[PDB]
Design a protein around this nucleic acid. Structure first.
Ligand SMILES: Nc1ncnc2c1ncn2[C@@H]1O[C@H](COP(=O)(O)OP(=O)(O)OP(O)(O)=S)[C@@H](O)[C@H]1O
Ligand SMILES: Nc1ncnc2c1ncn2[C@@H]1O[C@H](COP(=O)(O)OP(=O)(O)OP(O)(O)=S)[C@@H](O)[C@H]1O
Ligand SMILES: Nc1ncnc2c1ncn2[C@@H]1O[C@H](COP(=O)(O)OP(=O)(O)OP(O)(O)=S)[C@@H](O)[C@H]1O
Ligand SMILES: Nc1nc2c(ncn2[C@@H]2O[C@H](COP(=O)(O)OP(=O)(O)O)[C@@H](O)[C@H]2O)c(=O)[nH]1
Ligand SMILES: [Mg+2]
Ligand SMILES: [Mg+2]
Ligand SMILES: [Mg+2]
Lengths: 330, 258, 492, 354, 318
DNA sequence: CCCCGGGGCCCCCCCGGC
DNA sequence: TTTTTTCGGGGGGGCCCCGGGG
């Protein structure tokens, strides 16, 4: 904990103010409007991993209370005990008592509330209803099916979308400026493609790419560096494998798959996922082809998830694709 | 045993100080500097703030080269302090960039040495200035009477209401089985100036506090024979126990009146 | 002091005499006769059973559905005979310690209030432990203590419960005289309902009373409550509001395992109109009424129906096979649920796989009587035999080279020819040799007996062993007991 | 006296009489036992895997390995459930069967084995090389029955404390063993003895026990009926000798186990009658078999192979039967209630036959 | 800003039974009970946010007048309601001596009673029976099945139904007139459609829309309240071509940040409540959905699994 | 120096979906 | 017309033993 430069990039680049949260303009604008006019309701933030929920709520707490927000809000997460007794005693005491420092309202942040038991959620209902005049609740979740309907009825919901491309590009530009790094356009495209809308993945991969350069001061990060550090297949490899499967005999396809995998030690799961993404754009005459492709590839993925024999699984992928595409003729 | 060396001539004083607020907070940062030791902690419910100060007059010897922050779990510290006899001097020892604090109990008459080490913890707490406020009412009364009143009223209700009016202090509790009200008035006896009740009022006040927090606070009565209560509307209630050199303060937030 | 107009009708019209209680006349008479002859049985040490057979039980156990009048009947029978009542309920603490402290000291103690009030029986205690079904707990819950006291008590004891067919009530299997209270007939309650309607000044059609009684499922208290709530505003209970009143006050009652099995296996609900009326959600809720036994009942009773939902060209056997396949899938899902991951969110899916789908594939008309699941007893028997096999295997470990399964499948058939057959062939002269073998493998007489039960099919030893002359078995026992034997596991 | 299967069990590597190549490999392993890795012996049941393991232990340490005692160990679960474990111990090795604790087998791995693993040997057990033995051997019987969590717990225990203990596991099949465990063990195949070797062993037992034999063909028939299981062949020989007054004739029939006879009767009934009532009676028979400690997997295998030996069935019926047997054997592997899967298999077979 | 605006669900909480919309017969019965007296033991069950707690509190207030503080004991899930509490505190309150008007009784309001344990409910039986001359019990719950039958036998059952769109519109218009809220018909229609009969949700959504954008129109309402994903799932499952269903999955659910577990659970529920389709087809689809749900629970929460589930459902429906 | 009140573990018993 | 498996949470009974008072 010497300096901020000894931290992982995911934590080192955590937004400190609402102005640094990207890709959530609608939610940020709405919550800022609520806070400015003192019309903050009970909030629920539902979204996938690494979209800015915790960052946004902490930034909102800073906006409301200032630099000393930590002593003016009650933050509980999955790493803490949040049983029914905790709800009855600690949350109830915090919600029904005035602030020690200031004279403002009180904020309770139940991060990862989807991990809370049903009994505690039920106990929270009357606590929320009874102390609304002076207390507000913020719930954060990735899975809404774990939240009781009663709790959902009492909260205003905001959905955090997967981060758009433009927000990721702007944050990457900021990180490159801070770190004195060069990123090629194709490298940025590949990084955004592999991120799948998660900023944490982008930051971790960028840190690994920087660590992979011999001389980061002048060396530039190319798509080759990204693929090498992440150990992911290149688009050319996927295209070649798919072409061999769809246009060559069994021996040639098997040899091509083995050679492509052994060239860089690729994983079969990555090849399957990339081929599925490519095939999703194909215009197929017969629906049976798509049905068989999806079912067989899902079965192969599930089997791979439990281990098994890699060679048999690869041959199964080849055979499944060939058999499914055999239906396009008639 | 180079940077920080602070010797309590009596090892029981530090044990009493820790016991005064060990049931209120668990993780506490002790800041030691040339003019003594300070500490501030906030309860998990964030309703009570504990502030401890010990000056250099409270130590037989005290030496601190640079300010040092020691994060401790009060349960472990109390466990360690319970292993020392009442007739042994207690030395607190810490070095540069410390990961531990050494507590050394010495009995020169018996030539007995007992050294314990307690691992420090990383606490991200910044000392929050307790800005002084001009309180509407300020009173002082013996700690034993306040403890008795609080314990008696806690049997009836979980909330105790304190009303300060001209020449009168009233503690009221209302509960399922019944209600109770204790009324005291400022009284001075020159013969024994330790049972006196002193009050200075500027604006009458009425504030309700949780009974459990008052029960925790009254545990500091073992440190001082008197307790000072400062109350003011729209501000936390201050309960102060005075030590020989320093003090122990509790800031308790009142309950919302709604 | 309390105005009679501010009292609930259930209190105003409570039965003040034993002849005022409607229904279950036989059970009330049985209880009266048992309690009136308690002293006579005591003089005979509760040994000489009487004409009714209620002479060997020192405590009565009244049980039935809610709202029939068990508590009132027990209280009235207690007062009529002049006894003093010591009543306890779930509102009081009745754990092991509290039971041993308070009620244990009253089972053979005189009543001080009885002494001061004064019949020859007014100084004795009739303990009435109501709501025993609510005594949550196992050994420390006090249920075992009450069962023990039912075996030892100097004064009459009455226990009242609702669901006697409960595992927690097992300790009371045979300790008390059972007395059944059943849903009273409509005719018995009609007189009281008419009287109450007349006194309360509202219009009640005599015919509507039958429908009202059907709605409450023989719950007189609920009938009176419904009458009160309806008469609050609507004082004209005509035939134009029967349906609304019945549907507004239809108690939601969880069905019992036999009823669940009967309803789930009915073919009407799986028809188009039946499905429209009784939806899939209703079937899943029916499963959830008792999710621990419903799959077991379905598995037990899905091969004993005449289907009415067979597809054109499908035979009964094919539907049975499909149901069995889905039952296997449901079993796999159940294993997934009750694992370290605790995947209880799959409970609804289980409902479909274990009960609803197989039932829908063979739903029809029952070809017999719904039978209780036989898997539980079979599982207990298997556990017992596996424990016996483990004991035998670890007695013979030093001599054999195999696992317990190998011992069962290979060793035991050969052990029989050296342990049982020589007795059948040689007779008494086979004693010593057998013991010799028993000594080489650290076998005990109990091990011999246990081994002689594992065999099945053509090698069952029950009749064969039973046919051995008693002299040979006596000689075997005596010779075994008259010699020292080795020990394998000498725990210290 | 002791059964002939136990009385004549070899006690040394040089006393083995079948699978000479395996004997040579084991002798090579025991030549320099200081760096011996963890061993996993896999093979058909009743072949001599435990006998060979004990012989290898005797070669490494000495005859004292056969001085076996039985102790009892206590275990406590998270719910304060007291569990007893029977441990077979020797001055040089321990024997444990964690499957006896069922789902609690993990505890045995987490506490007992670990406790032995952490404890360094301080007994001066001078070896052939002149230096005292350094590690203590632990045998895990029925290792294929261990739960996946116990196998996972075994990994770092094997890796970290290899200097203090060495594991010998014995299994009928390696399919239930997780890949990390197989990676951590030296795998040793234990082939079943040939018919000639079984006949030689049986003839040796016959001449040692002075049993009248009309011809040597009876031993060959016994070996053939045993299907390569030496324990079964020896026990069958003893049973036949007892049943014929220690005088085996060429017409003496092969004695079959009671459960085998019941399964054959069930197969005949299934082939003859295919209806719901027949299914109910089959369920009754299956319950009877399961109640008396007949494993479900054994029942399924025996039923499948008995059905496949029926002469009236055609190729399509047999193919369907084997397919259903595979599917329902997987279901049994992934299930709890075995009767459910067995009934499903029987119903599917009944449907296919019609 | 340290100020807080009072939520309209609290500012406009009904204070008398006359201000409660919906369930006209039940509210009329409660009004008659309040006017006359002799309140019986009652259990009120219904779905969230329809006016059960409001009804109970209004009844107690109007029945007890100034004696509300002394004659009402309110316990909810946020309080301790164990066996000790039932055996001591509730019993003491029932035995308490309190002079009341000629036809009034003390009231114990056990809100969210469906969360109470079986032991406490069993203990309540004799307390209710013995002291019925001075105390009466009111239960409010979401699931009446959780209440043990012995308690149900002693109580009067008053079941509440979902509020119709007319009642919701009436209450919303009243609140709008009180608050001077600018609105359009489409905005109110969208609010009512998204509320789904939950008055609390409708009021909260209206207040949030007014705070965030001022004008309550369709655009702003949808900008605040998202389209219910169950309807999207229902559209996905009833699509004719597999391509359309896959497109819906990829665009309206997967790219909107909905987790695979949520999607599969919603699909299961929607298929269960799909009365338009034959029951056997629904059972087959439920089997496939359960397979996919188990796979997701094992950790394979990929879009390919959902696509395969959709393909299998399409095959079944063919 | 001895008895009583009340905090803290220890042990066991039952649920788990909409 | 009768009666089973596992974590985790919650509840509830039972001591145990420190502290404080007399
Ligand atoms: N909108 C964002 N803008 C900038 N960085 C972001 C953003 N979202 C996530 N990150 C980055 O990823 C890190 C984690 O962000 P979080 O706010 O913790 O996401 P999250 O949605 O709360 O994750 P979960 O729900 O606990 S898995 C931040 O410190 C940032 O560095
Ligand atoms: N047989 C009955 N005859 C007349 N009234 C009855 C009868 N049974 C019940 N009631 C009425 O309902 C009220 C309660 O009767 P109870 O004696 O408590 O029945 P119960 O079977 O003991 O109920 P449980 O098992 O404790 S829920 C009586 O005061 C009567 O008003
Ligand atoms: N019938 C109604 N009439 C007017 N307002 C209502 C009505 N129902 C709900 N509300 C409003 O929504 C708010 C909450 O109503 P509640 O009475 O708490 O619903 P509820 O049935 O108790 O919900 P649950 O079951 O506790 S989650 C009230 O303060 C009212 O402002
Ligand atoms: N004569 C002889 N008998 C053997 C040999 N190997 C095994 N056996 C016999 O076969 C019996 C069963 O062998 P066992 O070790 O239990 O096989 P496992 O079940 O695979 O471990 C033993 O009791 C031995 O008597 C061998 O090499 N020579
Ligand atoms: Mg987060
Ligand atoms: Mg009763
Ligand atoms: Mg409510």
């Amino acid at each position: 904990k010497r300096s901020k430069e000894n931290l992982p990039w995911v934590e080192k680049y955590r937004p400190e103010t609402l102005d640094e949260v990207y890709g959530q303009n609608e939610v940020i604008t709405t919550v800022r409007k609520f806070v400015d006019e003192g019309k903050l309701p009970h909030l629920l933030f539902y979204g996938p991993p690494g979209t800015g929920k915790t960052s946004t709520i902490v930034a909102l707490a800073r906006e409301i209370y200032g630099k000393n927000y930590s002593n003016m809000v009650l933050e509980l997460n999955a790493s803490d005990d949040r049983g029914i007794d905790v709800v009855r005693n600690q949350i109830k005491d915090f919600a029904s008592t005035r602030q020690i420092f200031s004279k403002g309202f009180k904020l309770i942040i139940l991060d990862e509330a989807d991990a809370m038991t049903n009994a505690a959620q039920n106990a929270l209902r009357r606590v929320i209803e009874r102390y609304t005049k002076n207390t507000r609740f913020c719930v954060l979740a990735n899975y809404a099916h774990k939240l009781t309907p009663a709790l959902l009825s009492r909260c205003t919901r905001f959905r955090f979308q997967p981060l758009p491309q433009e927000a990721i590009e702007r944050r990457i530009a900021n990180v490159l400026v801070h770190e004195k790094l060069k990123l090629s356009p194709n490298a940025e495209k590949a990084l955004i493609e592999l991120s799948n809308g998660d900023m944490r993945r982008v930051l971790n991969v960028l840190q690994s790419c920087k660590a992979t350069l011999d001389n980061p001061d002048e060396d530039e990060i190319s798509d080759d560096v990204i693929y090498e550090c992440c150990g992911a297949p290149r688009p050319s490899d996927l295209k070649a494998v798919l072409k061999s499967i769809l246009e060559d005999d069994w021996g040639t396809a098997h040899y091509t798959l083995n050679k492509v995998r052994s060239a860089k030690g690729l994983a079969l799961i990555d090849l399957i996922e990339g081929i599925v993404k490519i095939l999703e754009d194909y215009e197929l005459q017969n629906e049976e082809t798509r049905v068989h492709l999806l079912t067989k590839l899902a079965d192969i993925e599930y089997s791979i998830s439990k281990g098994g024999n890699d060679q048999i699984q690869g041959s199964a992928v080849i055979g499944a694709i060939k058999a499914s595409f055999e239906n396009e003729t008639k | 045993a180079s940077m920080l060396e602070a010797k309590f001539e009596e090892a029981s004083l530090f044990k009493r100080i820790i016991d005064g607020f060990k049931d209120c907070v668990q993780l506490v940062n002790f800041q030691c500097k040339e003019d003594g030791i300070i500490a501030q902690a906030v309860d998990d419910s964030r309703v009570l703030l504990v502030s401890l100060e010990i000056g250099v007059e409270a130590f037989q010897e005290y030496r601190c080269d640079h300010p040092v922050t020691l994060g401790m779990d009060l349960t472990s510290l109390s466990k360690i302090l319970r292993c020392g006899n009442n007739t042994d001097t207690l030395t607190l020892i810490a070095d540069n960039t410390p990961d531990s604090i050494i507590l050394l109990f010495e009995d020169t008459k018996k030539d007995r040495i007992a050294e314990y080490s307690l691992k420090l913890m990383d606490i991200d707490a910044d000392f929050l200035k307790i800005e002084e406020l001009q309180y509407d009412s300020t009173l002082s009364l013996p700690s034993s009477e306040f403890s008795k009143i609080v314990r008696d009223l806690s049997q009836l209700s979980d909330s105790i209401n304190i009303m300060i009016t001209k020449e009168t202090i009233k503690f009221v509790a209302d509960g399922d089985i019944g209600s109770g009200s204790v009324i005291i008035k400022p009284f001075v006896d020159m013969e024994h100036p330790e049972t006196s009740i002193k009050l200075e009022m500027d604006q009458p006040v009425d504030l309700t506090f949780g009974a459990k927090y008052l029960l925790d606070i009254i545990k500091g009565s073992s440190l001082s024979d008197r307790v000072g209560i400062r109350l003011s509307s729209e501000a936390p209630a201050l309960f102060q126990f005075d030590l020989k050199s320093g003090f122990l303060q509790f800031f308790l937030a009142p309950k919302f009146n709604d | 002091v309390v105005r009679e107009e501010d009292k609930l009708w259930t209190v105003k019209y409570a039965p003040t005499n034993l002849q005022q209680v409607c229904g279950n006349k036989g059970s009330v008479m049985k209880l009266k006769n048992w309690l009136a002859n308690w002293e006579n049985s005591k003089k005979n040490s509760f040994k000489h059973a009487g004409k009714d057979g209620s002479g060997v039980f020192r405590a009565a156990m009244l049980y039935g559905p809610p709202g029939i009048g068990k508590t009132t009947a027990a209280h009235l029978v207690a007062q009529e005979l002049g006894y003093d009542i010591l009543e306890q309920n779930a509102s009081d603490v009745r754990s092991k310690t509290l039971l041993n402290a308070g009620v244990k000291n009253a089972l053979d103690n005189m009543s001080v209030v009885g002494y001061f009030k004064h019949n020859l029986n007014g100084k004795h205690f009739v303990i009435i432990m109501d709501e025993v079904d609510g005594m949550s707990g196992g050994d420390r819950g006090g249920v075992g203590q009450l069962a023990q006291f039912c075996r030892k008590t100097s004064t009459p004891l009455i226990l009242i419960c609702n669901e006697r067919n409960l595992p927690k009530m097992r300790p009371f299997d045979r300790v008390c005289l059972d007395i059944q209270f059943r849903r009273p007939d409509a005719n018995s309650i009609k007189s009281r309902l008419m009287t109450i309607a007349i006194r309360e000044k509202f219009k009640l059609d005599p015919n509507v009373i039958d429908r009202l009684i059907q709605t409450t499922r023989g719950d007189i208290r609920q009938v009176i409550n419904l009458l009160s709530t309806i008469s609050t505003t609507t004082k004209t209970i005509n035939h134009e509001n029967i349906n609304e009143i019945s549907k507004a006050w239809e108690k939601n009652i969880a069905l019992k395992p036999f009823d669940i099995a009967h309803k789930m296996l009915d073919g009407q609900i799986y028809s188009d109109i039946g499905s429209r009326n009784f939806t899939l959600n209703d079937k899943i809720a029916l499963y959830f009424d008792d999710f621990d036994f419903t799959p077991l009942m379905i598995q037990e009773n899905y091969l004993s129906t005449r289907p009415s939902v067979l597809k054109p060209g499908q035979s009964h056997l094919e539907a049975v096979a499909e149901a069995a396949n889905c039952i296997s899938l449901g079993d796999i899902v159940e294993k997934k649920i009750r694992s370290s991951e605790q995947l209880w969110s799959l409970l609804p899916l289980h409902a479909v796989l274990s009960s609803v789908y197989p039932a829908s594939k063979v739903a029809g008309h029952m070809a017999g009587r719904i039978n209780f699941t036989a898997w539980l007893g079979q599982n207990s028997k298997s556990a017992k035999y596996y424990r016996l096999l483990q004991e035998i295997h670890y007695h013979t470990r030093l001599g054999t080279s195999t696992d317990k399964i190998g011992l069962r499948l290979d060793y035991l058939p050969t052990f029989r020819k050296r342990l049982l057959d020589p007795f059948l062939k040689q007779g008494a002269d086979a004693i010593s040799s057998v013991i010799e073998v028993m000594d080489d493998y650290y076998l005990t007489k109990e091990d011999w007996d246990s081994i002689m039960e594992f065999f099945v099919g053509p090698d069952v030893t029950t009749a064969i062993i039973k046919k051995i002359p008693a002299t040979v078995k006596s000689g075997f026992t005596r010779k075994y007991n008259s010699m020292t034997h080795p020990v394998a596991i000498y725990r210290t | 006296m002791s059964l002939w299967v136990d009385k004549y069990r070899p006690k040394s590597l040089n006393a083995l009489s079948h699978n000479e190549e395996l004997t040579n490999f084991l002798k090579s392993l025991s030549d320099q036992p200081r760096d011996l890795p963890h061993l996993l012996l896999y093979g058909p049941n009743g072949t001599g895997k435990k006998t060979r393991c004990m012989a290898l232990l005797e070669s490494i340490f000495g005859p004292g390995v056969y001085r076996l005692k039985i102790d009892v160990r206590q275990f406590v679960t998270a719910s304060n459930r007291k569990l007893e474990l029977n441990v077979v111990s020797s001055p040089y090795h321990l024997e444990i069967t964690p499957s006896d604790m069922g789902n609690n087998d993990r505890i045995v791995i987490q506490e007992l084995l670990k406790e032995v693993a952490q404890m360094e040997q301080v007994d001066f057990q001078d070896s052939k090389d002149g230096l005292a033995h350094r590690y203590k051997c632990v045998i895990i019987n029925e290792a294929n029955s261990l739960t996946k969590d116990a196998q996972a717990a075994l990994r770092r225990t094997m890796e970290k404390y290899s200097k203090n203990i060495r594991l010998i596991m014995v299994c009928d099949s390696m399919s239930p063993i997780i890949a990390p465990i197989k990676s951590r063990c030296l795998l040793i195949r234990c082939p079943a003895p040939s018919d000639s070797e079984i006949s030689t062993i049986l003839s040796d037992v016959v001449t040692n026990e002075r049993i009248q034999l009309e011809t040597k063909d009876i031993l060959k028939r016994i070996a053939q009926a045993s299907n390569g299981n030496l324990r079964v062949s020896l026990l069958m020989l003893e049973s036949m000798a007892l049943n014929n007054e220690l005088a085996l004739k060429s017409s003496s029939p092969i004695i079959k186990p009671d459960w085998i006879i019941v399964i054959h009767k069930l197969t005949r009934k299934i082939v003859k009658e295919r209806s719901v009532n027949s299914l109910i009676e089959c369920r009754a028979v299956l319950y009877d078999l399961l109640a008396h400690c007949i494993p479900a997997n054994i029942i399924l295998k025996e039923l499948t192979f008995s059905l496949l030996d029926v002469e009236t069935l055609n190729t399509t019926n047999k193919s369907s039967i084997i397919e259903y047997s595979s599917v329902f054997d997987e279901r049994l592997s992934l299930g709890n209630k075995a009767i459910f899967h067995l009934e499903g298999f029987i119903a599917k077979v009944m449907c296919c036959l019609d | 800003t340290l100020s807080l605006q009072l939520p309209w669900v609290e500012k406009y909480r009904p204070q008398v039974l006359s201000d409660i919309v919906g369930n006209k017969e039940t509210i009329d019965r409660l009004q008659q009970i309040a006017k006359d007296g002799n309140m019986p033991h009652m259990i009120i069950s219904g779905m969230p946010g329809i006016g059960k707690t409001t009804s109970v509190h209004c009844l107690a207030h109007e029945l007890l007048g100034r004696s509300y503080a002394d004659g009402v004991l309110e316990l909810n899930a946020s309080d301790d309601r164990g066996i000790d509490v039932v055996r001591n505190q509730i019993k003491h309150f029932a035995q308490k001596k309190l002079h009341l008007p000629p036809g009034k009784h003390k009231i114990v309001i056990l809100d969210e009673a469906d969360s109470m344990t079986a032991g406490a409910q069993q203990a309540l039986r004799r307390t209710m029976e013995l002291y019925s001359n001075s105390t009466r019990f009111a239960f409010a719950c979401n699931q009446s099945n959780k209440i043990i039958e012995p308690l149900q036998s002693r109580c009067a059952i008053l079941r509440y139904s979902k509020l119709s769109d007319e009642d919701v519109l009436k209450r919303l218009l009243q609140i709008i007139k009180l608050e001077d809220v600018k609105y359009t018909n489409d905005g109110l229609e969208a609010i009512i459609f998204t509320a789904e009969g939950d008055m609390r949700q409708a009021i909260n959504n209206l207040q949030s829309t007014v705070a965030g954008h001022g004008l309550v129109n369709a655009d702003n309402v949808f900008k605040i309240v998202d389209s219910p994903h169950p309807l999207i799932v229902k559209k996905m499952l009833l699509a004719s071509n597999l391509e359309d269903s896959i497109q819906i999955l990829r665009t309206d659910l997967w790219k909107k940040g909905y987790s695979s577990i949520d999607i599969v659970t919603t699909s299961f529920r929607v298929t269960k409540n799909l009365a338009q389709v034959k029951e056997s087809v629904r059972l087959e689809m439920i089997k496939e959905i359960g397979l996919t749900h188990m796979r997701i629970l094992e950790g394979v929460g990929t879009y390919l699994q959902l696509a395969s589930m959709l393909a299998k459902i399409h095959k079944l429906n063919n």
